[PDB]
């Protein structure tokens, strides 16, 4: 079983609400109570992929996630339509906050990421640090689109903090 859990305030903070998978709009939500600008943050575990839609009727800027979205995105100022569909379970990785696995963690499924969603998809510009792959290998790229120097994390690294300069793009192999 699965269920996406949103948050009322940004930063994963603010009252939360669990919503079962499937496709719905402001209609179903009207039945619950939450609607419009409220999904400030999001926590979606693996096994199921979620897709948000700003304007109702599944329209307006759309988002896609499978893990826990911290900052969510820029359109967090308006939400109502969403769509989630069961997805095959796959391993992933885990990044901590404070330098020394002493800060909230964030997971990210396999795949590549840029410098825009990545940050606003799990953490932010600079704040990752200590990393810990829960199954696959993580690779950090300094410059944008996986370019410039790189820090291939082919193993556990509960302590990186001051190392490069600012992880821009990444790739979980
Ligand atoms: Ca925010
Ligand atoms: Ca350290």
From Swiss-Prot:
UniProt similarity note: Belongs to the beta/gamma-crystallin family.
Domain of life from the UniProt record: Bacteria
Protein name: Development-specific protein S
Binding site for Ca(2+) 2: 37, 54, 78, 80
Region described as Connecting peptide: 87-90
SMART domains hit by this protein: XTALbg (SM00247)
Gene: tps
UniProt remark on domains: Has a two-domain beta-structure, folded into four very similar Greek key motifs. The N-terminal domain (NPS) binds 2 calcium ions.
Binding site for Ca(2+) 1: 8, 38, 40, 77
Short name of one Pfam family: Crystall
Record's keyword annotation contains Ribonucleoprotein: no
Ranges of residues in domain Beta/gamma crystallin 'Greek key': 2-46, 48-86, 91-135, 136-173
InterPro entries in alphabetical order: Beta/gamma_crystallin, G_crystallin-like
Gene3D superfamilies in alphabetical order: Crystallins
UniProt keywords, alphabetically: Calcium, Metal-binding, Repeat, Sporulation
Organism lineage string: Bacteria, Pseudomonadati, Myxococcota, Myxococcia, Myxococcales
Native species: Myxococcus xanthus
Biological process according to GO: sporulation resulting in formation of a cellular spore
């Amino acid at each position: 079983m699965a269920n996406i859990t949103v948050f009322y305030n940004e930063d994963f903070q603010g009252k939360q609400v669990d919503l079962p998978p499937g496709n719905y709009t402001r209609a179903q939500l009207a039945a619950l109570g939450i609607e419009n600008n409220t999904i400030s943050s999001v926590k979606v575990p693996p096994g199921v992929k979620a897709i948000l839609y700003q304007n109702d009727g599944f329209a307006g800027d759309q988002i896609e996630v499978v893990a826990n979205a911290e900052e969510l995105g820029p359109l967090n100022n308006n939400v109502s339509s969403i769509r989630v569909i069961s997805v095959p379970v796959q391993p992933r990785a885990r990044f901590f906050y404070k330098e020394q696995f002493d800060g909230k963690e964030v997971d990210l499924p396999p795949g590549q990421y840029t410098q825009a969603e990545l940050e606003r998809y799990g953490i932010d510009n600079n704040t990752i640090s200590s990393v810990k792959p829960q199954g696959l290998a993580v690779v950090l790229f300094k410059n944008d689109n996986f370019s410039g120097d790189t820090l291939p994390v082919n193993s556990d690294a509960p302590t990186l903090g001051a190392m490069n300069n600012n992880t821009s793009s990444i790739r979980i192999s």
